[PDB]
């Protein structure tokens, strides 16, 4: 039982495991983050509002003024997404802020206040966002990628053997802010405890204990328990608490309480404490091996004589022990020297430190930022304390204070975004204690310790700094004015926070052009996870911390949805089901136990909790009147794995695709592929492009309907009802009183895109999927887009595939395609691209634009406006004009024996340079839009003023339909309220509305329900009373183009980039390669059906690719498409309606190992038949990745294709009628054509552009350049001994103007020879060397 | 880290790979493909600097009078024949009147 639009389309899952949750709308790290950056939140600590709440009220340091605040705002837009391409200006609107001022009694003592003033002011701009989760910035969808960074606070790592005079093994503690300056704590090479304040040069770690204000025995009371000795009746003894054995380098042997405890060699590292606490020990007796090397902590004396024995900070010795044996005063306080037990590094570095007090421990820090400059007393304190407590220079958020307290095992759920001058003691304790195993490293790449920084967080981090670095003239001049008579505004500049926040989405370190190759690519782009920028590193200044994998990726971040090459792992994607808590820690869905079984009481849990509860793996299985057929439940934790009994479990995974991101989640057999080709599969589906006759993945996962809606590329019934109009750009519906809101007309609208540019110059368009009078439910599909088939995804097309080598072309994932593909105009792609021109501010003001280029290429001119511009709808190719930027030439010399021809005898008209904008040599396809723009006081040019009436026609018509569509709902509600008792109301739905006022209904309140609706009507339609002009003067709008430009012009091209060789293709399972010949339908193998095969791809390569999902998609596609081919034949003869039902139902009904069923007996014998059209493409299939339709199910379903259930068939050759020495792999694969496009990249050159800087060629397609014969390319000619071919590149084909201008013409000499003159790039260098100051010249031989 | 794991893949590509067998072997694949994409620089930069030192050996002359030479051998690591006389000697030239009794 399936919906009303599903009567056209239903997908067949095969999966096996107990999901009770499905796809969430994939875009949240854009969407919810954009909201919380720009939300009026009353008590939160994030976004624009929290940035202002961290700086304002600015109660001035001058004590005479205050710039107060109330809240942000956004409002007052003018551009919209259409103008944000057609014009191009970033889709943005002004940030404005509520500000105030207050002043007090200057003169009296009984009123306390005297003045109060408050307003709004401007404070910047903000880009704007679509329902589709996109943004539009300089003509293009430039979009922020989210970051995955070390969580702010502190970290604790271990440089366990780096380098230098002892390969130095280390442990550390290191500050990492959300915003700010720095501090590290570690050890020097010699092994003193050391520090790097702001990570500058070496300082002894006692300095900061003086700065934070602790004297020597306070440092002991903060970091050291204190060892105790005695001497009793006949022996030496020590005195204890039952944890004081934690590090001892035990050369020695001990008993305590009543058994042996320590023995010769067994170093008592803190692991050992679990020998002692259980045993209540408070006294021990030891060899002298633990009664020296223990530094006495006070002075001691001898009443046997009247004398001393030793002083504080002194050792013990056999003679001192002999005097202690006499003493009377038989006690000693002593220090821990055992390493990590307490770290003696403090005690000893307290005597390897020149600093003495807090002033020295701040003055020496001033030197560490200002060598050779006087340490200005008060600024020596500020320079250090403002590293951690400044208005501009430190923050953590509540998130980073939480991580700080968490990595220190605190209980304070209370604290500050700043540090404190005593929090630092615990950072130092952890370093003193860690360094051989009281603990270990802070679990860095745990995905609840590394943290997400979403789009709105990445914008927030700028406002946490810009408000405390740039406001200078405001912060200055606020001190000076008598603000009883001046205002909370009077010095605020407005230029910078426009561009600096508009283009934070268009030129920022994470805000690239979105991957608009096709819908799947933009859907995953919106949830990309960068490891880069402030919080990570780059591609270059980075190791494997930015590229590899750590097991907490499970359920959260798929390790294969990354670019390839050196870019590996630097940017990733969020798995389908994954999200984050209020700390940006990553989380996942789970099933959960009640009374004895893993119930359907589903939950979500953090990466940290995956390290704290027993999660069963997706393997496990339920039972009859019992519990589990899974006797030995396989389980998992932190990303690791185990085996347990039933009596031991808390949770389980909900699905397998919870471990998988969008591109990877469409690979139906990852059960059978290596990661190196799964990586390719996660990118080839993204490089794929819109095609003229698109067709669906027949094999599939289920994501083939989610990814059709996860960016709105298909329109969907957000309310639903009955379809009421349908048009190639427009759709409307009507609704009923079960939903219809308290005064509406009962309507929705679902209009559709048409032709514009994109970020990889792909085409954009949409088309309907419903018709007049169809009822549709709240989730039915209403339209299609650039990569769909009538209600599901189509990133490509299906083709028949032979997995065999052919006559040479297909060696290395390279692809043969049939002539039949060109006949059907298939894998032809469609593109929309833009080209432009200018007229500069001259001394008058304008510049010329026309078509005059006489006797230079006349046919490439025939296609133009009066203004020198092509027409919308005209075809253009290879060299046609687009915008008439002609330029006259000159030659001028013209003396009585130099007037050789023109200026007397012929062509006595212009010599205009071929400088007008033209179609590039290789481009072909229709002009689709044309524009002209100017400084606004000039109302717009004739070619834009005709296009005003081209755009006005659409709205002038549509609003004349809309007004009728609107009142045909609204007055139909009034008509219905009348029909409820005044049943004769069809005498009224045939009148002017004013004449309904001669009426009445019944002696009951329906009468007054009619009255109040008739009163309300004249207010309601004021909605319509604007509409047409609200598009018009966005076209006739002007914009300034900066001083230097009066006007700008554009043309757009629909480039029909056809199927051709050298272009690139792929399939879902990581097969990727060039189209390497087009083959006649018989120049190809044919099946046991007596029928040829559309594509051929080499299997000899496959064992080096280590992947087999490509074979399984091909074989399951042979069943899936074979169902549709058999339907095309069966629909003709029909045989019996129960025979149409036999095959069409059996295609769905055939299964044996499955959670789902398209049970077509739960659908009627015409729902069976409306579905048959979209089944002629083939049967659509589903399979959660790792839950899938394995080989045995393919070998069952193939009894619908009815071809050999081996998947390996007696192929023939169309040219010869032969049949090969063995059966061969065949089927039908889902395949793709990819935006590498050789079509765009035909770049050769005879001669062209030259770099004035060096007389050498320029380089670039965007420069028509010459290309680099590199140093390695020289090594080949050197190695060959090929000196003339090498010298050719070095002068007569490059910078030597003399050489290249003679060699070009040396064909006219007939003697095609070299005639070089001087390598100008060496002539350049001979004067650059002299411009540095080095003299250089020549000799002769 | 480069070292082996107690967690095998007892299956093969026709038997299949579960989520864990995929996920664990994907760590080794990421490491190997990241070294593939980086450790080339530790050979290409060295190759660039090598040619500056290597260039001048153009075959210019004929015998150079150097009546001395290296006592080369087959690659015999004491206890293998990893390269016979042929491959190492391949169109080099003698520097002594070499003679060995044995069979001819």
mmCIF file of N, CA, C and O in Angstrom, chain A residues 587-643:
data_model
loop_
_atom_site.group_PDB
_atom_site.id
_atom_site.type_symbol
_atom_site.label_atom_id
_atom_site.label_comp_id
_atom_site.label_asym_id
_atom_site.label_seq_id
_atom_site.Cartn_x
_atom_site.Cartn_y
_atom_site.Cartn_z
ATOM 1 N N UNK A 587 27.392 12.308 17.261
ATOM 2 C CA UNK A 587 26.460 11.311 17.797
ATOM 3 C C UNK A 587 25.661 10.582 16.700
ATOM 4 O O UNK A 587 25.667 10.959 15.526
ATOM 5 N N UNK A 588 25.011 9.489 17.103
ATOM 6 C CA UNK A 588 24.535 8.406 16.223
ATOM 7 C C UNK A 588 23.272 7.769 16.830
ATOM 8 O O UNK A 588 23.160 7.759 18.058
ATOM 9 N N UNK A 589 22.331 7.216 16.034
ATOM 10 C CA UNK A 589 21.166 6.501 16.563
ATOM 11 C C UNK A 589 21.476 5.059 17.012
ATOM 12 O O UNK A 589 22.267 4.348 16.386
ATOM 13 N N UNK A 590 20.756 4.585 18.036
ATOM 14 C CA UNK A 590 20.862 3.224 18.585
ATOM 15 C C UNK A 590 19.492 2.653 18.993
ATOM 16 O O UNK A 590 18.640 3.370 19.518
ATOM 17 N N UNK A 591 19.281 1.343 18.805
ATOM 18 C CA UNK A 591 18.240 0.561 19.508
ATOM 19 C C UNK A 591 18.700 0.279 20.944
ATOM 20 O O UNK A 591 19.900 0.306 21.212
ATOM 21 N N UNK A 592 17.778 -0.036 21.858
ATOM 22 C CA UNK A 592 18.018 0.045 23.316
ATOM 23 C C UNK A 592 17.262 -1.042 24.090
ATOM 24 O O UNK A 592 16.146 -1.407 23.724
ATOM 25 N N UNK A 593 17.853 -1.587 25.156
ATOM 26 C CA UNK A 593 17.266 -2.704 25.930
ATOM 27 C C UNK A 593 16.136 -2.281 26.884
ATOM 28 O O UNK A 593 16.199 -1.243 27.542
ATOM 29 N N UNK A 594 15.133 -3.158 27.020
ATOM 30 C CA UNK A 594 14.125 -3.165 28.102
ATOM 31 C C UNK A 594 13.810 -4.616 28.490
ATOM 32 O O UNK A 594 13.685 -5.467 27.611
ATOM 33 N N UNK A 595 13.706 -4.888 29.798
ATOM 34 C CA UNK A 595 13.433 -6.162 30.513
ATOM 35 C C UNK A 595 14.148 -7.471 30.076
ATOM 36 O O UNK A 595 14.095 -8.456 30.814
ATOM 37 N N UNK A 596 14.859 -7.503 28.945
ATOM 38 C CA UNK A 596 15.640 -8.655 28.470
ATOM 39 C C UNK A 596 16.002 -8.666 26.975
ATOM 40 O O UNK A 596 16.702 -9.579 26.548
ATOM 41 N N UNK A 597 15.537 -7.701 26.165
ATOM 42 C CA UNK A 597 15.770 -7.669 24.702
ATOM 43 C C UNK A 597 16.041 -6.234 24.226
ATOM 44 O O UNK A 597 15.529 -5.282 24.814
ATOM 45 N N UNK A 598 16.833 -6.076 23.156
ATOM 46 C CA UNK A 598 17.070 -4.808 22.429
ATOM 47 C C UNK A 598 15.787 -4.352 21.712
ATOM 48 O O UNK A 598 15.533 -4.665 20.544
ATOM 49 N N UNK A 599 14.938 -3.645 22.450
ATOM 50 C CA UNK A 599 13.678 -3.063 21.972
ATOM 51 C C UNK A 599 13.857 -1.903 20.989
ATOM 52 O O UNK A 599 14.919 -1.296 20.853
ATOM 53 N N UNK A 600 12.749 -1.580 20.331
ATOM 54 C CA UNK A 600 12.557 -0.492 19.368
ATOM 55 C C UNK A 600 12.439 0.902 20.026
ATOM 56 O O UNK A 600 12.113 1.879 19.358
ATOM 57 N N UNK A 601 12.694 1.009 21.337
ATOM 58 C CA UNK A 601 12.803 2.262 22.104
ATOM 59 C C UNK A 601 14.058 3.080 21.711
ATOM 60 O O UNK A 601 14.909 3.352 22.557
ATOM 61 N N UNK A 602 14.233 3.405 20.425
ATOM 62 C CA UNK A 602 15.454 4.031 19.883
ATOM 63 C C UNK A 602 15.892 5.313 20.622
ATOM 64 O O UNK A 602 15.083 6.043 21.197
ATOM 65 N N UNK A 603 17.200 5.573 20.625
ATOM 66 C CA UNK A 603 17.890 6.696 21.279
ATOM 67 C C UNK A 603 18.964 7.263 20.323
ATOM 68 O O UNK A 603 19.259 6.657 19.294
ATOM 69 N N UNK A 604 19.595 8.379 20.697
ATOM 70 C CA UNK A 604 20.848 8.889 20.117
ATOM 71 C C UNK A 604 21.881 9.004 21.244
ATOM 72 O O UNK A 604 21.487 9.316 22.368
ATOM 73 N N UNK A 605 23.164 8.732 20.969
ATOM 74 C CA UNK A 605 24.241 8.765 21.978
ATOM 75 C C UNK A 605 25.563 9.310 21.404
ATOM 76 O O UNK A 605 25.911 9.090 20.234
ATOM 77 N N UNK A 606 26.328 9.988 22.258
ATOM 78 C CA UNK A 606 27.613 10.612 21.916
ATOM 79 C C UNK A 606 28.732 9.606 21.594
ATOM 80 O O UNK A 606 28.704 8.447 22.009
ATOM 81 N N UNK A 607 29.780 10.055 20.891
ATOM 82 C CA UNK A 607 31.011 9.271 20.694
ATOM 83 C C UNK A 607 31.642 8.782 22.019
ATOM 84 O O UNK A 607 32.198 7.687 22.078
ATOM 85 N N UNK A 608 31.503 9.578 23.085
ATOM 86 C CA UNK A 608 32.001 9.274 24.434
ATOM 87 C C UNK A 608 31.226 8.095 25.037
ATOM 88 O O UNK A 608 31.813 7.191 25.631
ATOM 89 N N UNK A 609 29.907 8.077 24.861
ATOM 90 C CA UNK A 609 29.020 7.005 25.321
ATOM 91 C C UNK A 609 29.172 5.703 24.536
ATOM 92 O O UNK A 609 29.094 4.622 25.120
ATOM 93 N N UNK A 610 29.502 5.783 23.245
ATOM 94 C CA UNK A 610 29.970 4.617 22.490
ATOM 95 C C UNK A 610 31.225 3.973 23.124
ATOM 96 O O UNK A 610 31.473 2.787 22.923
ATOM 97 N N UNK A 611 31.976 4.704 23.954
ATOM 98 C CA UNK A 611 33.074 4.192 24.785
ATOM 99 C C UNK A 611 32.687 3.807 26.225
ATOM 100 O O UNK A 611 33.586 3.606 27.037
ATOM 101 N N UNK A 612 31.391 3.738 26.572
ATOM 102 C CA UNK A 612 30.910 3.506 27.947
ATOM 103 C C UNK A 612 29.718 2.527 28.091
ATOM 104 O O UNK A 612 29.434 2.122 29.218
ATOM 105 N N UNK A 613 29.054 2.102 27.008
ATOM 106 C CA UNK A 613 27.952 1.119 27.049
ATOM 107 C C UNK A 613 28.166 -0.032 26.046
ATOM 108 O O UNK A 613 28.896 0.121 25.063
ATOM 109 N N UNK A 614 27.502 -1.177 26.245
ATOM 110 C CA UNK A 614 27.619 -2.340 25.347
ATOM 111 C C UNK A 614 26.630 -2.249 24.181
ATOM 112 O O UNK A 614 25.442 -2.553 24.314
ATOM 113 N N UNK A 615 27.148 -1.858 23.014
ATOM 114 C CA UNK A 615 26.413 -1.783 21.745
ATOM 115 C C UNK A 615 26.634 -3.077 20.945
ATOM 116 O O UNK A 615 27.754 -3.376 20.530
ATOM 117 N N UNK A 616 25.575 -3.850 20.705
ATOM 118 C CA UNK A 616 25.581 -4.959 19.749
ATOM 119 C C UNK A 616 25.757 -4.458 18.300
ATOM 120 O O UNK A 616 25.223 -3.416 17.913
ATOM 121 N N UNK A 617 26.480 -5.213 17.470
ATOM 122 C CA UNK A 617 26.595 -4.904 16.041
ATOM 123 C C UNK A 617 25.317 -5.302 15.280
ATOM 124 O O UNK A 617 24.530 -6.148 15.724
ATOM 125 N N UNK A 618 25.168 -4.763 14.066
ATOM 126 C CA UNK A 618 24.082 -5.070 13.130
ATOM 127 C C UNK A 618 23.908 -6.569 12.782
ATOM 128 O O UNK A 618 22.878 -6.945 12.232
ATOM 129 N N UNK A 619 24.864 -7.447 13.112
ATOM 130 C CA UNK A 619 24.740 -8.899 12.925
ATOM 131 C C UNK A 619 23.513 -9.513 13.633
ATOM 132 O O UNK A 619 22.847 -10.383 13.069
ATOM 133 N N UNK A 620 23.232 -9.070 14.862
ATOM 134 C CA UNK A 620 22.380 -9.789 15.823
ATOM 135 C C UNK A 620 20.908 -9.992 15.407
ATOM 136 O O UNK A 620 20.371 -9.300 14.539
ATOM 137 N N UNK A 621 20.245 -10.996 16.007
ATOM 138 C CA UNK A 621 18.977 -11.555 15.513
ATOM 139 C C UNK A 621 18.038 -12.043 16.639
ATOM 140 O O UNK A 621 18.462 -12.788 17.526
ATOM 141 N N UNK A 622 16.753 -11.674 16.553
ATOM 142 C CA UNK A 622 15.666 -12.052 17.479
ATOM 143 C C UNK A 622 15.150 -13.504 17.271
ATOM 144 O O UNK A 622 15.806 -14.285 16.580
ATOM 145 N N UNK A 623 14.031 -13.874 17.916
ATOM 146 C CA UNK A 623 13.682 -15.249 18.348
ATOM 147 C C UNK A 623 12.149 -15.475 18.532
ATOM 148 O O UNK A 623 11.379 -14.514 18.514
ATOM 149 N N UNK A 624 11.688 -16.718 18.756
ATOM 150 C CA UNK A 624 10.263 -17.076 18.981
ATOM 151 C C UNK A 624 9.946 -17.349 20.469
ATOM 152 O O UNK A 624 10.545 -18.218 21.096
ATOM 153 N N UNK A 625 8.959 -16.633 21.034
ATOM 154 C CA UNK A 625 8.534 -16.681 22.461
ATOM 155 C C UNK A 625 9.701 -16.603 23.489
ATOM 156 O O UNK A 625 9.553 -16.992 24.647
ATOM 157 N N UNK A 626 10.853 -16.058 23.073
ATOM 158 C CA UNK A 626 12.113 -16.068 23.822
ATOM 159 C C UNK A 626 12.840 -14.720 23.823
ATOM 160 O O UNK A 626 12.425 -13.797 24.521
ATOM 161 N N UNK A 627 13.959 -14.626 23.099
ATOM 162 C CA UNK A 627 14.940 -13.539 23.232
ATOM 163 C C UNK A 627 15.778 -13.266 21.962
ATOM 164 O O UNK A 627 15.456 -12.353 21.203
ATOM 165 N N UNK A 628 16.824 -14.056 21.707
ATOM 166 C CA UNK A 628 17.753 -13.911 20.578
ATOM 167 C C UNK A 628 18.173 -15.284 20.040
ATOM 168 O O UNK A 628 18.623 -16.133 20.813
ATOM 169 N N UNK A 629 18.110 -15.474 18.718
ATOM 170 C CA UNK A 629 18.816 -16.563 18.009
ATOM 171 C C UNK A 629 20.331 -16.304 17.971
ATOM 172 O O UNK A 629 21.118 -17.244 17.919
ATOM 173 N N UNK A 630 20.744 -15.038 18.065
ATOM 174 C CA UNK A 630 22.125 -14.624 18.345
ATOM 175 C C UNK A 630 22.585 -15.120 19.736
ATOM 176 O O UNK A 630 22.339 -14.476 20.756
ATOM 177 N N UNK A 631 23.211 -16.300 19.797
ATOM 178 C CA UNK A 631 23.681 -16.912 21.055
ATOM 179 C C UNK A 631 24.890 -16.192 21.687
ATOM 180 O O UNK A 631 25.016 -16.131 22.912
ATOM 181 N N UNK A 632 25.754 -15.612 20.845
ATOM 182 C CA UNK A 632 27.037 -15.000 21.207
ATOM 183 C C UNK A 632 27.175 -13.619 20.543
ATOM 184 O O UNK A 632 28.022 -13.410 19.677
ATOM 185 N N UNK A 633 26.271 -12.714 20.930
ATOM 186 C CA UNK A 633 26.135 -11.324 20.465
ATOM 187 C C UNK A 633 27.478 -10.637 20.215
ATOM 188 O O UNK A 633 28.186 -10.241 21.145
ATOM 189 N N UNK A 634 27.830 -10.462 18.940
ATOM 190 C CA UNK A 634 28.965 -9.605 18.584
ATOM 191 C C UNK A 634 28.634 -8.141 18.882
ATOM 192 O O UNK A 634 27.549 -7.646 18.572
ATOM 193 N N UNK A 635 29.574 -7.448 19.522
ATOM 194 C CA UNK A 635 29.395 -6.104 20.069
ATOM 195 C C UNK A 635 30.551 -5.185 19.648
ATOM 196 O O UNK A 635 31.482 -5.610 18.955
ATOM 197 N N UNK A 636 30.466 -3.906 20.012
ATOM 198 C CA UNK A 636 31.412 -2.850 19.631
ATOM 199 C C UNK A 636 31.421 -1.706 20.649
ATOM 200 O O UNK A 636 30.425 -1.488 21.334
ATOM 201 N N UNK A 637 32.538 -0.985 20.741
ATOM 202 C CA UNK A 637 32.703 0.178 21.632
ATOM 203 C C UNK A 637 33.898 1.040 21.204
ATOM 204 O O UNK A 637 34.909 0.508 20.760
ATOM 205 N N UNK A 638 33.772 2.372 21.278
ATOM 206 C CA UNK A 638 34.705 3.411 20.764
ATOM 207 C C UNK A 638 35.161 3.250 19.291
ATOM 208 O O UNK A 638 36.063 3.961 18.850
ATOM 209 N N UNK A 639 34.559 2.322 18.542
ATOM 210 C CA UNK A 639 34.947 1.900 17.188
ATOM 211 C C UNK A 639 35.640 0.524 17.118
ATOM 212 O O UNK A 639 35.804 -0.018 16.027
ATOM 213 N N UNK A 640 36.030 -0.045 18.261
ATOM 214 C CA UNK A 640 36.555 -1.410 18.440
ATOM 215 C C UNK A 640 35.408 -2.448 18.561
ATOM 216 O O UNK A 640 34.228 -2.086 18.537
ATOM 217 N N UNK A 641 35.721 -3.745 18.695
ATOM 218 C CA UNK A 641 34.781 -4.866 18.496
ATOM 219 C C UNK A 641 35.010 -6.060 19.433
ATOM 220 O O UNK A 641 36.155 -6.396 19.726
ATOM 221 N N UNK A 642 33.945 -6.776 19.810
ATOM 222 C CA UNK A 642 33.992 -7.934 20.718
ATOM 223 C C UNK A 642 32.923 -9.008 20.423
ATOM 224 O O UNK A 642 32.121 -8.885 19.491
ATOM 225 N N UNK A 643 32.899 -10.059 21.253
ATOM 226 C CA UNK A 643 31.886 -11.122 21.308
ATOM 227 C C UNK A 643 31.460 -11.310 22.772
ATOM 228 O O UNK A 643 32.323 -11.496 23.632
#
